Design a binder for this molecule. Structure first.
Ligand SMILES: *C(=O)[C@H](C[C@@H]1CCNC1=O)NC(=O)[C@H](CC1CCCCC1)NC(=O)c1cc2ccccc2[nH]1
Ligand SMILES: *C(=O)[C@H](C[C@@H]1CCNC1=O)NC(=O)[C@H](CC1CCCCC1)NC(=O)c1cc2ccccc2[nH]1
Lengths: 298, 298
């Protein structure tokens, strides 16, 4: 069981460099629009930014947009939430089939980490319950896109915006809505406490059974409402959609509630043993990742 | 610290679907040659294989090679170690600048996991000291390529071949040499014992220091010679190349000998605490990765 990214080839062709005055970051070129964070036009980030004022003084000739080696001709730019839509005169002939989607709590996606208009890394990640992610971004990563591949099309779900004081990372949907409601402002912002994604830990243990790792499995069941009471006080999400696990419960013969029991126990530590090579419960893998990696089903 | 892959776009254009009879796996199409595992032509996989015999009875009309939706035309094939070089009429016009390199023990690289000639996932891995990797492959992944991006070119380093009884994964170089000397035969083969990569664990601990996670750091030094006598009997590799860590020692003020000392004690357990979110020592990240991810430098 390995955490994988979906391939990045369709997305790489859309990444561009967006320069405005004294700032450089990344943009996403789809059709004749380049999407990027609006804070690229902020002329002074020492203190609170009045983005209406910044937009009113914005001058189109201060933009430079580069795709690989070619300059794109900027013809207009409008502000939408915390993003800019920059109209260029060239159409990206490598625009993939795509849509835009806003992630829900816990949902998996892929980050293409880009610098200077060029992709440098790719990884799978989950939107955490506090609406941040643990990216690896350093300065210059803003505008890096997050995406999912689904039925032959690219769902664009994340545009990188800011790093919080804690080191956690916040982006926006491509509608311009910042995840978690955080502001593109210079001052300190603090995220809510993270919660372990219970549905993913369940999938993790099903994966463990399927690979023969069963030293932790016991016959006792913990009822869902009894588990949810425990979760609320111990930093775990509640259990929902138990039906979703039916394919895994059938193939293993282990009901969900026996794994809820194991979570409550295994949270106190593994005692030196390892589950699939991990020394603590892992919440990285969704049910769909587990069935895909072990069976080839989507 | 997040495990990442380098982007996959350049390599996706080279993956093809290779079918011989009723066996289907992946090929790597470079110039006018398709590289793939030679066991694609083995007519009976249930017993010892005489590849000289199988090569002598190979009939080229049994091949089907598809790139996306186009069929490639086979004009010849030759056998080189545990690979086949299949000469086609068509030159891959998306062949990147590239070379073939053979991994050293402990070296990091990227896998593009493919099925039916189509990339499905991408992840970073290390060649382990026992010449296996911890992959996540199911039937049909054979021929999936491993690569590194360096200096404006693709280094092709791994062609996926077999899964061992233990679940570990074994490949060959593209020059046809199986990593670890394993055979492309259907009998049980057992790998040697894996060792923890000391230089990676030292990189890991430096990353922890750089992130102000030093609860585990003490003042005592442990000399390299003494660490190494402990390592040889405790499942860790010897410490080498401590000059690369000089820049991190200088930057941090913490010499390598204080981290070797920490490895010795922390191997016994973390006492319920965590380091960068891990519950035990982690050997997945090289010094190169740590420096690239935190400081942007190759
Ligand atoms: C865009 O390229 C960068 C990417 C940041 C920088 C480091 N790691 C990242 O992910 N984003 C920024 O530089 C913003 C700048 C805008 C923020 C919104 C309003 C003004 C401009 N800066 C940060 O995100 C930032 C600064 C900072 C200082 C100390 C601790 C954390 C921190 N995060
Ligand atoms: C190629 O696509 C597959 C990839 C394997 C399949 C399962 N997970 C993988 O990574 N490789 C194979 O199918 C080889 C084919 C053999 C042909 C004859 C010579 C040796 C290779 N089979 C295996 O790798 C294999 C069979 C097997 C049976 C029981 C336990 C493990 C196991 N691994």
């Amino acid at each position: 069981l390995r955490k994988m990214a979906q391939p990045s080839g369709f997305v790489e062709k859309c990444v561009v460099r967006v320069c405005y005055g004294n700032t450089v970051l990344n943009g996403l070129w789809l059709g004749d629009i380049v999407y990027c964070p609006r804070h690229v036009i902020a002329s002074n980030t020492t203190s609170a930014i009045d983005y209406d004022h910044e937009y009113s003084i914005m001058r189109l000739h201060n933009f430079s947009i580069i795709s690989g080696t070619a300059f794109l001709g900027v013809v207009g730019a409008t502000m939408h939430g915390v993003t800019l839509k920059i109209k260029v005169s060239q159409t990206n002939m490598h625009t993939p089939r795509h849509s835009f989607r806003t992630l829900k709590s816990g949902e998996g996606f892929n980050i293409l980490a880009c610098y200077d208009g060029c992709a440098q890394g790719v990884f799978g990640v989950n939107m955490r319950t506090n609406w941040t992610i643990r990216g690896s971004f350093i300065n210059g990563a803003c505008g890096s896109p997050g995406y999912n591949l689904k039925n032959g099309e690219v769902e664009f779900v994340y545009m990188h915006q800011i790093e919080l004081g804690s080191g956690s990372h916040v982006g926006s949907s491509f509608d311009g809505v910042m995840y978690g409601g955080f502001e593109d402002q210079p001052n300190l912002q603090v995220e809510s406490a993270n919660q372990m994604l219970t549905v993913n830990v369940v999938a993790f243990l099903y994966a463990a059974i399927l690979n023969g790792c069963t030293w932790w499995l016991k016959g006792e069941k913990l009822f869902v409402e009894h588990y949810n009471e425990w979760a609320q006080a111990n930093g775990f999400t509640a259990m929902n959609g138990e039906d979703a696990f039916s394919i895994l419960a059938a193939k293993t013969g282990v009901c969900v509630e026996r794994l809820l029991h194991a979570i409550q126990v295994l949270n106190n530590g593994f005692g030196g043993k390892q589950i699939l090579g991990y020394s603590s419960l892992n919440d990285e893998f969704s049910i769909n990742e587990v069935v895909k990696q072990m069976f080839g089903v989507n």
